[PDB]
Paper text:
The potent neurotoxic venom of the black widow spider contains a cocktail of seven phylum-specific latrotoxins (LTXs), but only one, α-LTX, targets vertebrates.
The four N-terminal CDs are remodeled in an extended coiled-coil needle, whereas the C-terminal domains preserve their overall arrangement. The distal end of the tetrameric coiled-coil needle is formed by the most N-terminal region of the protein (helices α1–α3 in state 1) and might correspond to the transmembrane region of the pore. We, therefore, conclude that the mushroom-like cryo-EM structure of state 2 indeed represents the pore state of α-LTX. During prepore to pore transition, helix α5 separates from the HBD and undergoes a reorientation of almost 180 degrees. This way, it forms an intriguing rigid tetrameric coiled-coil with the α5 helices of the other three monomers. In addition, helix α4 of the CD folds into a continuous helix with α5. In this manner, the coiled-coil elongates, positioning the N-terminal helices α1–α3 of the CD at its lower end to form the transmembrane domain (TMD).
Author numbering:
A (entry chain B): 283 to 543
B (entry chain C): 152 to 1065
C (entry chain D): 152 to 282
Write the structure that this text describes.
Amino acid sequence: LNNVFLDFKSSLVGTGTSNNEGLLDRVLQVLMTVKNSEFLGLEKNGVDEMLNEKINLFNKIKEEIEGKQKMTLSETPENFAQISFDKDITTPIGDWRDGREVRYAVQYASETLFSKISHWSDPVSVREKACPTLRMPVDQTRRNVLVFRKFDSSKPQLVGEITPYLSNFIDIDRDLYNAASNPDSAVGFKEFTKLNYDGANIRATFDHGRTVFHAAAKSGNDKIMFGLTFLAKSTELNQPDKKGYTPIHVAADSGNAGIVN
Amino acid sequence: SIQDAKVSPIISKINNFARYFDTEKERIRGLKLNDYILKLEEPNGILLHFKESRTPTDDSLQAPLFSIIEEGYAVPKSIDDELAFKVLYALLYGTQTYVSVMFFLLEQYSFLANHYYEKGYLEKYDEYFNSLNNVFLDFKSSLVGTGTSNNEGLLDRVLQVLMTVKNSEFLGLEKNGVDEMLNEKINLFNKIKEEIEGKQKMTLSETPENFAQISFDKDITTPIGDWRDGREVRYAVQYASETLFSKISHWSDPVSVREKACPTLRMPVDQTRRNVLVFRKFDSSKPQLVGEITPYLSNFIDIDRDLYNAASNPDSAVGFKEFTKLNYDGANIRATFDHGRTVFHAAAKSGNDKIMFGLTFLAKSTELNQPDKKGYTPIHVAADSGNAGIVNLLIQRGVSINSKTYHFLQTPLHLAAQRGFVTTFQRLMESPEININERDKDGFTPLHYAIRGGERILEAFLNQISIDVNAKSNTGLTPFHLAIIKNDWPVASTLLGSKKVDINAVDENNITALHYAAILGYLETTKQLINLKEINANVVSSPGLLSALHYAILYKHDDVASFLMRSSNVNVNLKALGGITPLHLAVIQGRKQILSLMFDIGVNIEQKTDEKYTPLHLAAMSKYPELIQILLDQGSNFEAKTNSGATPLHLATFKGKSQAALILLNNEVNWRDTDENGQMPIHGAAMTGLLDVAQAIISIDATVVDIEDKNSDTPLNLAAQNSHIDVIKYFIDQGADINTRNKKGLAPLLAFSKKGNLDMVKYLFDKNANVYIADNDGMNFFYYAVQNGHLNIVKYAMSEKDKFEWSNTDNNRRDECPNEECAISHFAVCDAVQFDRIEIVKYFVGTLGNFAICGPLHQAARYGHLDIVKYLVEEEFLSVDGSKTDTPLCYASENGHFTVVQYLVSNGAKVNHD
Amino acid sequence: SIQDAKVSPIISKINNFARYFDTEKERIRGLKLNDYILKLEEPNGILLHFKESRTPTDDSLQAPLFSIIEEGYAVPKSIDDELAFKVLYALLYGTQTYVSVMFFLLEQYSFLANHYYEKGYLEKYDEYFNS
């Protein structure tokens, strides 16, 4: 998309004035030459007026192309500067497996324009540690950045959002989210309890605004829902998503009768 | 037409390919970085098409080139239209595009190969290396050939065609010049041929030999390091060429590991005796560099790189334990990897304090300050990573704080400012002998990178007691300048609040940051700084005396300019160099609403430049005609005067803009007003060559057909000199008087003879206009006609023998030459001999019955022309003595021409004769 | 002139293909071993072009010769039919180049086949076998 937009835009009018100035100006020039040529009284005078309205249409579309803005963002943010497993956690929790490698990527967060995802970082072997700490340089343009994580060649997963003036990026939020969304019940409950004891926020947002409550509703776990509903303020239980789905909507879609009651 | 049909496809294709390549060349050269990468990496883009451009396919280059070469249509056939020459130029232009595409492909493939080699992605690096090698070899063979053989190459064939055209020599009035820059093209082709022969391959194709044996003699327990049970290991070898690229060899067979971790491998001795780098890969993960082999090294152990990964491990306790185990087993620390990288640098990258603490004991000062090939000292890497404990340990060891990097000269303080970590700076300030500011390649202070870092680093720097806020770089940009050009207002506000900053600071060209904001059209920043801060907006730049409003108006930035003119803080009467006022500059840009707004605010309509030009005149001096209409609707002086008195209609006719003249006539601007020279605008219209204005002015007043300025030259004479058919035909449709003369005495017939068109000549001769017209000097039309050397006008003149008589002679020429009563034909032949044009002399000889009356030998001896004298002595059989007692040898001796005298002596003429 | 214009594109194309193939025939043979494999293994190399040369596309080899034989312009008509002998010679040249290009790719494909066979690499060996 980026290539075709830039290249076609250069073809029509050009990114800058030059000896060619696009093919539209050549069409205008040849039409002006036709005007300068001798014309008939009535009939190809009508041809003259229809080519005049064609010239008006060409001017309008040329102005639209010049005023047309780019729908993509070729600029790319910077990856993490240093990584360290400072947290005292044991490895066999969540997707963190011995002998596995993790690749991180960053992308600009633009609401109206598409943004390029950065090249994946160098592989990092994981052993005896599960929760990594990422340190990020301050953004040049001061834009919030989405962060993506990939294990080996599996499905990449969005993991969080970084503000321009935040550097100490801890990686526990998506681990908790997957703990609440795991198909299993007992293992998911135990690892959720371990992560909660470790320390992780609840209002984290993923997948168009879904929350640990939405993940619990979709998975169908009952013990974690019972643990969460205690000391839970009613606003988060009715928190809607970007599309507008609520936890009860997700529960109805999943079809889990217990969480419904 | 048939030949044109035959040649149109190939010529259209070559022209289209050439223009496409040129447009893409500038487009690609004008791109950004990620844009460059995306465009160059397109699966089906211009790189593959350019590689296929040397294929024998239809749309390629070589097929049209060899087709036009073989068919032989480039060589002209006698004299014809400009089609053989045009296809020849097309061939030359296509060959130039071919060699330019060759260089284009070389440079971009080399850049791609380097860009993917620096990262370490060998899979794409190998593909780009092969592409570059194939492109180089194929294009070198296609241009000149691998050797002198029957193929002969392509440029040699082009030169052969050029010599064939040169020896064709059908005509030479201009073709000797044409073939002359064809010889220049031949020299250029020879130069580029010598360049490509002298150019060497940038790729080393030959690959080394892999290891001959593998062993696991060393007793290392397998879980340690990157050694995983059940994981395959592969090795590759590459030549270490500092100047050229080297191919990576094919990977070795998978090798399984179990209970052993450190392998011992044996390498054969290389024949060329060059060091070879060894690459190691685990499964499909990222390949790593494990070491280098000297020509006379047999055993290689990769334990050195394993220690490098041990020091770079993200974990702390496991990394320290494995480092201790490897040190106990025995591994050197002086080993280098990647971009000349050092183990201490890896320890700095990891940030593990344990390995640093262990290494500093029994260390050396030079090792702690040892840089890589890029000049990144360990403190540089520590500052870039952002760790604090390793920095504190390094300071306690007394490392060099003023370490600098090659090429881009940056201290670790610059790295900290760019990254934006206030902790690293606040830990570095306890180090003594530290310098607050440094001079970079552009002299950029660390504050210039802190403003990029963020607000917190700026607060940290401004909190320091020792800081130079008004630092000036080599380019001349103060910190405020490039802090505000980036549009981060909060950081600029933080900088201003902490301590006073010289807002009125200027560059060498007297450029203020406000001027940058105006020229770049960020209106919000301009409003913020104008309202909440005080600034002198009347400062002018050093070149051109341009101001803030001028910069805002330039490059069509209308909102900012409107905001500035709405505010009363900045004035409008300010005058720049050249006299261009805000009204004049808005006219140059041609924006309407800006002019309407500044007229609403209030300004004099008749602003004056240095030369008193009225804004209406400059509105005529613009591509937008609506400016004249809007100015006259708002009210403007129709008869406004300048220092030269030039009227807007005068200027419009001088430039020749038809729309301006049409709208001025529609608005009925008086044409009576003249300039200082008194020239009527019809004179400028004739200069440009506009006709509709001529009919309009004749309709308004027919008297202007013979109007004259102080130059006293009629418009008909000027139109004839300008060589425009329409105006001359028009004035002869009214039929202006032919006897009108200026002070120079030039006549329209003189200009027609200068142009040489036979149609006007036959109208003038049928009009029976006198050809004996003379000016104050006394020269006549006949002399200029003979000087022009136009034969067919002369034939048509002698066809009507009634109007001109050869026997009759002009009396004025008899008066000017009382001694020689030469006739018109006689003296004309003698002048033709004087003109040194042999063709004209032989023309007159053919027309005139007896050429001996002029005595061409004596005249030629007087003029000292070798060729004429030789031709008349040999082919005309002219007697050397001549009818007169004076020999031409006396004239030749008087003139002193060498070859003429030698030839006359060889003819038998004697110098002894009186 | 019209007859020459009619036969100009096909004769030019067949001559270009013939001379290009003759040049590459000794270009490839005199190339070093390491560059030989790299030159052959180009994704859009000359081997793919030679394989496509059998297709009925305009740029391929058959369309000129088949057009010549179908239209019957190779047979001289009347005296001084210079174009007839020219297109006939082009036809024989095209047939010779077609036979030589058929004999060409077999050696390189067989060589790639066993060269990869010695070290395994059966994924590429299967592709070369099919080719």
